[PDB]
Amino acid sequence: NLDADLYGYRWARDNVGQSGATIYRLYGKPNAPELFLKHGKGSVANDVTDEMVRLNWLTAFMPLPTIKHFIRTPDDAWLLTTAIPGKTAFQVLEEYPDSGENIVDALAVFLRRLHSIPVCNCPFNSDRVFRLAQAQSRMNNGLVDASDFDDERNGWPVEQVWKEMHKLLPFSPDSVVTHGDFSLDNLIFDEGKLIGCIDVGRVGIADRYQDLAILWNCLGEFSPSLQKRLFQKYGIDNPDMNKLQFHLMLDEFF
Numbered sequence: 001n002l003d004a005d006l007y008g009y010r011w012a013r014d015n016v017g018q019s020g021a022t023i024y025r026l027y028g029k030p031n032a033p034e035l036f037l038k039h040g041k042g043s044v045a046n047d048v049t050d051e052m053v054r055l056n057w058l059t060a061f062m063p064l065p066t067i068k069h070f071i072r073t074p075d076d077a078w079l080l081t082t083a084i085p086g087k088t089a090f091q092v093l094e095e096y097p098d099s100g101e102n103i104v105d106a107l108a109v110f111l112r113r114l115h116s117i118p119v120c121n122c123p124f125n126s127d128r129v130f131r132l133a134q135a136q137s138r139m140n141n142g143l144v145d146a147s148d149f150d151d152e153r154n155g156w157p158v159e160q161v162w163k164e165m166h167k168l169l170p171f172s173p174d175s176v177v178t179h180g181d182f183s184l185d186n187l188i189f190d191e192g193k194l195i196g197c198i199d200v201g202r203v204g205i206a207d208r209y210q211d212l213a214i215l216w217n218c219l220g221e222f223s224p225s226l227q228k229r230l231f232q233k234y235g236i237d238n239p240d241m242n243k244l245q246f247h248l249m250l251d252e253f254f
């Protein structure tokens with residue numbers, strides 16, 4: 001069982017937009033750090049499982065929550081991790097908009113760090129063909145949230161987004177180690193420093209634009225100038241807009 005690690009903590013049920021899994025926040029225990037327990041049943045358990053192995057693999061390189069405990073049974077996955085103290089990049093942007101330049105600088109450096117991890121270390125695949133297949137299996141089961149499409153695709157039928165996506169293909173792949181969901185909700189700041197990332201479930205090998213696109217979009221809600229810096233700090237001279245557009249369209253399906 002699990003209980004030894006759970007005496008003393010009190011419980012809260014977070015909703016961070018998290019696909020499928022129930023997230024409990026464990027707190028209140030003195031001399032003990034906040035904890036998260038992710039719980040997935042049925043198919044979603046696979047997803048909790050995927051995150052555990054990636055947390056476990058990736059922490060050899062980046063700063064992650066540590067796996068205090070994981071349980072898999074035929075239909076249920078439970079994942080207990082330590083919390084990363086701090087606020088999301090998004091919150092820190094909102095609260096201190098005269099700090100965006102250092103936050104985007106920090107985000108780029110960090111993303112460069114992740115991507116510099118040599119692929120020969122990484123046992124996980126998440127290239128477009130993998131994701132594309134996944135995206136179809138969510139389209140053709142009507143799980144794609146058309147409500148949440150980016151503005152330039154607002155109210156489009158899903159089967160359209162799908163069709164317009166394959167027009168940009170093909171592009172030259174480049175392969176690095178990617179986060180999978182490099183959004184402003186998933187990087188944790190504290191005392192001005194970037195100190196860790198969360199939500200590592202889609203981590204694997206893919207085109208860098210998988211991470212660059214998603215973050216660049218999030219900074220769309222603040223300043224086109226902030227978006228520019230992201231690419232500028234990272235060191236790309238001319239953003240591959242085709243690639244950007246493809247990855248943003250692929251995220252629509254998840």
Ligand SMILES: NC[C@H]1O[C@H](O[C@H]2[C@H](O)[C@@H](O[C@H]3O[C@H](CO)[C@@H](O)[C@H](N)[C@H]3O)[C@H](N)C[C@@H]2N)[C@H](O)[C@@H](O)[C@@H]1O
Nearest residue numbers: 017019145148149150151181183217218221251252254
């Ligand atoms: N559905 C489940 C997913 O929900 C969010 O992802 C969605 C984005 O948020 C959407 O975009 C909107 O939100 C962005 C800021 O987050 C804005 O910049 C943008 N203009 C907005 O249209 C985008 N179209 C699809 C993407 N799947 C979570 O991050 C992700 O973890 C979670 O799995």
Ligand SMILES: COc1cc2ncnc(Nc3cccc(Cl)c3)c2cc1OC
Nearest residue numbers: 036038065081083084086087088185198
């Ligand atoms: C303070 O903001 C957060 C910190 C976090 N610190 C650690 N873990 C987080 N979430 C979490 C959710 C599921 C699984 C795991 Cl390992 C972590 C956190 C989520 C947060 O909300 C975005």
Ligand code: NA
Nearest residue numbers: 059062063064
């Ligand atoms: Na680590």
